[PDB]
Design a binder for this molecule. Structure first.
Ligand SMILES: Cc1ncc(COP(=O)(O)O)c(C=O)c1O
Ligand SMILES: Cc1ncc(COP(=O)(O)O)c(C=O)c1O
Ligand SMILES: OC[C@H]1O[C@@H](O)[C@H](O)[C@@H](O)[C@@H]1O
Ligand SMILES: OC[C@H]1O[C@@H](O)[C@H](O)[C@@H](O)[C@@H]1O
Ligand SMILES: OC[C@H]1O[C@@H](O)[C@H](O)[C@@H](O)[C@@H]1O
Ligand SMILES: OC[C@H]1O[C@@H](O)[C@H](O)[C@@H](O)[C@@H]1O
Ligand SMILES: OC[C@H]1O[C@H](O)[C@H](O)[C@@H](O)[C@@H]1O
Lengths: 422, 426
């Protein structure tokens, strides 16, 4: 049987990429800015004309397990035929066991399941505030949260209120108060911010994602945790982009040996199949959310839970932390040896595991020529902040595939440089 | 071959046998932000669910109107499995062969120029608020940071900090501040109060439900929405109409706003947009409003993902193919008529039976009866629901409920209320 979307699309006679871009332009809210993908499998996607590419954005680390992982799809399909949604107003035979699975895997007492990263962030801030008011006993409406410049956690009004990125906040106010912004990767600024006794939490990414793959100094996060703990301030660690093996370890916080007070997960939690996010913490923090104080229609639905248990298990069974660590060190090494020196407009090669970036001098080169050239050579990515090229493949990428992609990526940077010399 | 999926292997290894075993698992590992009816549902199909002990029930919450098409509608599940084999996520950073055609499908079905797909109701409300504000600053040219949005007391649109900031429900806001400013709360179903609030020129929008759901199935006087729209239009204020609960045939029309012949300036949809299969929401509006969201000013990882779009197109088509608007109008009018003729005369602690379509409620007097006795008795008679605000009993079945099931269910419901009354007389 043809699905309704397929039958409906056939009647439109969208044959070329430009037909799809025109349909897009006419009917889709125009809040995004080259290719029309119809199929994905593992590390590979295919456009509507049958051309193959490596996906080096991977849902900005939502597709760590690869596109259309057969185990994840089987778990989806099996659960979807049985039960998808009950609400948390009724019990069911999936939510409990799934939260226990997550509790045991990440080492926490309680799991709050929500749907998106932004909801996980809001839920953590809410928990941190109510905890501050109720357990830490700080004055009513006075709770503060410390975040870092160039953070990204969502697009809610409150997320906009805690952004330093002009386009994220501009003309969406007035703003939620209670945020203090400091420099990333700066313990001094954190110590200084931590003198205010009304601070409920410090909310931080172990590597800043959308900010430009800003990898902090080794130990930064341990130091930050020590400072938070000595002031009775919760360390909220956002691993929505950096967790789940992406950096070579189950949590990017494992590098600095930090167990977050509140952990956020998302994205690859579902292998990019359905939106599910998680907030985890110890009992005396998470239990501030009493009945009726927080909710979500779809949060914890049995379909997402079944998908997430399968997705998480893929990470472990395919040993994807080891694969990210190994391949990623080889990637950065090749790019350093074959590009530093030969390509003067490369500012920095940086990353951990398979979360990598090449920042370029956008005064010396058009970054978009790198993007175009990459696509020409079978590599799809999208930079952040104009000038930071991102390289974020599915972790399941094979040794042969990764060698091949690395060659095409290097060849792309070199072809842009040769064209510049003329 | 034969094999377990991991959720099954793991659950099997925990050796959970009784409902108490599952209740205890939930209490230990799941954040305790709900007060659930004590049942452990295992299978859902159409209007029915079964628990782990085998007991069968009619689902009379239906995900609070997330499952209008029934549990596990075979067409929606087939569309889900088919698209999931092919492509589930690209981001809007890349094009794909589904997202644009799905937005076009919706734009044409609802009559709007532009469609924004988000994931949850809360995200749709946040996005609409962002649109109305930026539009106010850039098109209406009101002063920087001065935009106001009018909402109604007892509204419910989400649990973000900004939603908490615009709530009048104590447990939604308490100890979650400090709050997002820029909200002006008025009584629901009060034209005079809306009129006075609209005298402030910094008002960007009026954000309103055609029936308040979580607030208690509060059905306004007829014409209330039409009148709200005329007032908003005369002051160059956007009418944002939240149909996340009331939309998609639930009230006997495609949109509840259709009763008043209102076309919202911004329309919010969600919940049954996916037939309860995956979270997807939508914000729709005319080009000169929606186009304020320029590249880089708003986004979402999973918003408009191809899996969700294929499910939503299938879910929407089910509404039309099974004529669920007509089924809701008919069955709902019979339900309310039956309940009034069988319960009002006999049951003194029912204050009111109200609703539209198959969005119905029975408000009880909780100073006279423990509402939880009604919930328990319903369950014992094969009916699952959860009240809102302590004392508003909700009857919101899947619209696919058959005539025979609906009659059977209505008998069970009437018998439940009369039995609690019989205990009260004693
Ligand atoms: C670190 C981090 N937090 C939060 C989010 C928000 O995710 P969502 O788009 O699922 O709301 C993202 C997505 O880009 C992210 O990378
Ligand atoms: C009218 C209305 N708006 C918004 C929401 C928020 O939906 P979600 O729980 O999917 O965020 C709901 C659902 O509870 C609703 O009924
Ligand atoms: O020129 C018209 C545009 O829209 C489509 O109708 C055509 O197929 C494309 O070639 C073009 O981008
Ligand atoms: C890809 O690579 C691995 O993740 C899995 O074992 C394959 O089944 C999948 O097609
Ligand atoms: O046939 C429907 C589905 O049922 C599940 O039990 C299988 O493992 C899936 O792969 C299959 O697509
Ligand atoms: O709530 C019961 C209701 O039925 C429907 C009509 O819209 C209402 O005006 C009537 O009061
Ligand atoms: O549809 C009405 C239903 O009501 C009865 O309780 C029967 O037990 C059930 O099998 C039947 O299908």
């Amino acid at each position: 049987r043809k699905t309704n979307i397929e039958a409906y699309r056939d009647g439109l006679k969208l044959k070329t990429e430009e037909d799809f871009f025109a349909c897009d332009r006419q009917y889709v809210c125009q809040n995004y800015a080259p290719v029309v993908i119809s199929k994905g499998k593992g590390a590979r996607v295919w456009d509507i004309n049958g051309n193959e590419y490596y996906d080096f954005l991977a849902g900005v680390s939502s597709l760590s397990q690869g596109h259309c992982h057969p185990r994840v799809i089987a778990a989806l399909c099996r659960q979807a035929e049985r039960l998808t949604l009950t609400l948390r107003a009724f019990g069911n035979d999936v939510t409990g066991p799934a939260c226990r699975f997550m509790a045991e895997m990440f080492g926490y007492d309680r799991v709050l399941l929500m749907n998106t990263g932004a909801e996980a962030g809001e839920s953590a801030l809410k928990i941190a505030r109510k905890w501050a008011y109720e357990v830490k006993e700080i004055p009513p409406d006075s709770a503060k949260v410390i975040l870092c410049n160039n953070n990204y956690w969502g697009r809610t009004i409150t997320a906009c209120s805690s952004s330093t990125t002009f386009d994220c906040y501009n003309n969406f106010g007035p703003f939620t108060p209670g945020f203090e912004l400091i420099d990333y990767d700066d313990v001094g600024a954190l110590e200084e911010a931590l003198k205010d006794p009304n601070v409920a939490a410090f909310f931080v990414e172990p590597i800043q994602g959308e900010g430009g793959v800003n990898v902090p100094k080794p130990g930064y996060l341990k130091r930050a945790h020590e400072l938070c703990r000595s002031k009775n301030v919760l360390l909220i660690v956002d691993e929505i982009q950096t967790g789940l093996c992406r950096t070579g370890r189950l949590l990017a916080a494992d590098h600095d040996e930090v167990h977050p007070d509140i952990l956020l997960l998302g994205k690859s939690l579902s292998a990019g199949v359905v939106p599910i996010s998680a907030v985890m913490g110890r009992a005396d923090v998470m239990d501030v959310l009493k009945p009726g104080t927080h909710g979500s229609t779809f949060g914890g639905n049995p379909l997402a839970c079944a998908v997430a248990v399968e997705a998480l298990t893929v990470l472990k069974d395919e040993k994807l932390a080891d694969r990210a660590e190994r391949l990623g060190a080889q990637f950065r090494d090749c790019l350093r040896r074959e590009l530093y020196g030969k390509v003067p407009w490369i500012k920095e090669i940086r990353g951990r595991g398979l979360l990598n970036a090449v920042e370029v001098d956008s005064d010396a080169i058009d970054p978009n020529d790198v993007v175009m050239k990459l696509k020409e050579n079978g590599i799809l990515s999208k930079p952040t902040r104009g000038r930071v090229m991102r390289f974020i493949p599915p972790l399941v990428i094979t040794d042969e595939e990764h060698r091949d992609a690395t060659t095409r990526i290097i060849k792309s940077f070199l072809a842009v440089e040769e064209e510049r010399k003329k």
